[PDB]
Swiss-Prot record, chain A:
Organism: Homo sapiens (Human)
Posttranslational modification: Phosphorylation by STK4/MST1 alters its binding affinity to TNNC1 (cardiac Tn-C) and TNNT2 (cardiac Tn-T).
Residues that bear Phosphoserine: S12, S45
Family: Belongs to the troponin I family.
Protein's name in the database: Troponin I, cardiac muscle
Domain of life the protein comes from: Eukaryota
Stretch of the intact protein here: 155 to 210 of 210
From Swiss-Prot, chain B:
Keywords assigned: Acetylation, ADP-ribosylation, ATP-binding, Cytoplasm, Cytoskeleton, Hydrolase, Methylation, Muscle protein, Nucleotide-binding, Oxidation
Compartment list: Cytoplasm, Cytoskeleton
Protein's gene: ACTA1
Protein name, per record: Actin, alpha skeletal muscle
Positions where N-acetylaspartate occurs in the chain: D1
EC number: 3.6.4.-
Residues carrying N6-methyllysine: K84
Natural source organism: Oryctolagus cuniculus (Rabbit)
Modified residues (Tele-methylhistidine): H73
A Pfam family matched in the record: Actin
Curated annotation (Swiss-Prot), chains C, D:
Entry text on domains: The molecule is in a coiled coil structure that is formed by 2 polypeptide chains. The sequence exhibits a prominent seven-residues periodicity.
Organism this protein belongs to: Homo sapiens
Portion held of the full protein: 66 to 120 of 284
The name this protein goes by in its record: Tropomyosin alpha-1 chain
Associated clinical condition: Cardiomyopathy, familial hypertrophic, 3: A hereditary heart disorder characterized by ventricular hypertrophy, which is usually asymmetric and often involves the interventricular septum. The symptoms include dyspnea, syncope, collapse, palpitations, and chest pain. They can be readily provoked by exercise. The disorder has inter- and intrafamilial variability ranging from benign to malignant forms with high risk of cardiac failure and sudden cardiac death. Cardiomyopathy, dilated, 1Y: A disorder characterized by ventricular dilation and impaired systolic function, resulting in congestive heart failure and arrhythmia. Patients are at risk of premature death.
Compartments in which it is found: Cytoplasm, Cytoskeleton
């Protein structure tokens, strides 16, 4: 009498687990573009004088 | 230079263009779909200055540029500018020439044929990509969401697609493609802000309004109660900082603009709105397929970030829907980026490696091949 | 020589000031990114509370 | 005047350079705090991902 509710609840879980496993495998396999970068600055602390350009 | 020749993945919308490589969970970079051109006479010499700017360059130097968008309502009308965008997107920024990698592009399933054909043609003839596959955007939204069944309503900048998919199959007779989108919400906001005393008409002004919308606007799940107060009191207004230090406040207009997705008449459009099109995508399917589509309204694309859109899209459908039935909105964090993410997922499937147009089949058949091999 | 040393000292000051300003721009850009990191952190922590709350 | 301006321009340069040095310290301190804030933010967000994932 319960054989089908077991089987039906399982079919739903197996499909949901499949679909989530597919997106999770890519989420976990590669993760660099999903991260961040230093984005550093210039400051010009070595600028002890004027440049060679006529504009400086 | 790469570990494997996986596909490059890029979602080209009417708003943003996003790209990265297949197998990751994010694009490396996002660009506006823009090619910019100077609208002024140069006077100083040796200032660098390009004849045309692409993507973020176009937006960054926009102070003296007129900015054009090559994509409108989901299709490419200016392929030359998309060629510039793809070069920048794939080679200048991801640092990968398409010549050595398959490329996965995207388009809606009822997207005019010329666009899926042109995307196939340019990547094969100007970039020499070894393979092509133009993805169904709804499919990618489902891949990113972890669903096989549901209505994909992608409310992007270009077009709202409204497609019912059941067990991985489309129900095409029930697709309600609608020419109501995020780009119209931006122009409506420029006009309503003009009514408030803050006129916006130029490219710079449009980019400001798009920034205002993205930070200040919302849908409101119950707009009648929300406007009764927002239109009556300053306590519901939110301030926005403009590039020159000016401050604009927006009240009921803050949600009235997004409200157009439910009230299309605000922009002169004849439409039922996105909640009724979701309803009809469900209702026009057979009764043994609607009980699953009602329980799976799949939100995707951009504009989905407005607070109240998911609840506003579930309440309206529930009101149109039969009683007893459970109506459910799925609105994951992979919003706006779900198509790109799904693209990455599709590209990495082992079964998808049999779906590619090779740069052999392409030349034998020509670009019309996209309809024989992709969709 | 006092004048050249002055042009050089004034230049040093101009360049040092160009850098006081470039440093203040970087300091404010970084302090702003920091305050924003902290606003975004407070938000992430609040959203963490929402995520933990969701849990 | 050139010499006084030199003492003052050199002083100004010294002060401007001293400000650059104080500001170099403000940069290193805020820069590190930003890298740390970005890590704190990433941490809160990673916790959010785990908490949301737990959810
Ligand atoms: N913070 C935000 N708030 C409201 N709407 C947004 C936000 N971010 C993105 N959107 C909107 O979504 C649209 C982008 O469409 P999109 O779905 O990302 O095309 P694509 O599928 O190629 O990525 C734009 O109109 C943009 O303003």
């Amino acid at each position: 009498m319960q054989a089908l509710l077991g089987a039906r609840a399982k079919e739903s879980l197996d499909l949901r687990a499949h679909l989530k496993q597919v997106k999770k495998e890519d989420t976990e396999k590669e993760n660099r573009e999903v991260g961040d970068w230093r984005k550093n600055i210039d400051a010009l602390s070595g600028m002890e004088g004027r440049k060679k350009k006529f504009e400086s | 230079d790469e570990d494997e020749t996986t596909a490059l993945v890029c979602d080209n919308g009417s708003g943003l263009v996003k790209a990265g490589f297949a197998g990751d969970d994010a694009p490396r970079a996002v660009f506006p779909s823009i090619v910019g051109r100077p609208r002024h006479q140069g006077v100083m010499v040796g200032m660098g200055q390009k004849d045309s700017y692409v993507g973020d360059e176009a937006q960054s130097k926009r102070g003296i540029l007129t900015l054009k968008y090559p994509i409108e309502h989901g299709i490419i009308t200016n392929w030359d500018d998309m060629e510039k965008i793809w070069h920048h997107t794939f080679y200048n920024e991801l640092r990968v020439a398409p010549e050595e990698h398959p490329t996965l592009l995207t388009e809606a399933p009822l997207n005019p044929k010329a666009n899926r054909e042109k995307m196939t043609q340019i990547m094969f003839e100007t970039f020499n990509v070894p393979a092509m596959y133009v993805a169904i955007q709804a499919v990618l939204s489902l891949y990113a969401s972890g669903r096989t069944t549901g209505i994909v309503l992608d409310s992007g900048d270009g077009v709202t697609h409204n497609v019912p998919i059941y067990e991985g199959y489309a129900l095409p007779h029930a697709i309600m493609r609608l020419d109501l989108a995020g780009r119209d919400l931006t122009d409506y906001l420029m006009k309503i802000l003009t009514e408030r005393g803050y006129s916006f008409v130029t490219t710079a002004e449009r980019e400001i309004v798009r920034d205002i919308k993205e930070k200040l606007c919302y849908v409101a799940l119950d707009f009648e109660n929300e406007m009764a107060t927002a239109a009556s009191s300053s306590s519901l207004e939110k301030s926005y900082e403009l590039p020159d230090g000016q401050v604009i406040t927006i009240g009921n207009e803050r949600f009235r603009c997004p409200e157009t997705l439910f009230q299309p008449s605000f922009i002169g459009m004849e439409s039922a709105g996105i909640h009724e099109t979701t309803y009809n995508s469900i209702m026009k399917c057979d009764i043994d397929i609607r009980k699953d589509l009602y329980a799976n309204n799949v939100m995707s694309g951009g504009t989905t970030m407005y607070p109240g859109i998911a609840d506003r899209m579930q309440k309206e459908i529930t009101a149109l829907a039969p009683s007893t039935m459970k109506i459910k909105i799925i609105a994951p964090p992979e919003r706006k980026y779900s198509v790109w993410i799904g693209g990455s997922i599709l590209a990495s499937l082992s079964t998808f490696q049999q779906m590619w147009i090779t740069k052999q089949e392409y030349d034998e058949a020509g670009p019309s091949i996209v309809h024989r091999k992709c969709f | 020589d006092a004048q050249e040393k002055l042009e050089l000292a004034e230049k040093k000051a101009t360049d040092a000031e160009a850098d006081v300003a470039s440093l203040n721009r970087r300091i404010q850009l970084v302090e702003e990114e920091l305050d924003r990191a902290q606003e975004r952190l407070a938000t992430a922590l609040q959203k963490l509370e929402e995520a933990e709350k969701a849990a």
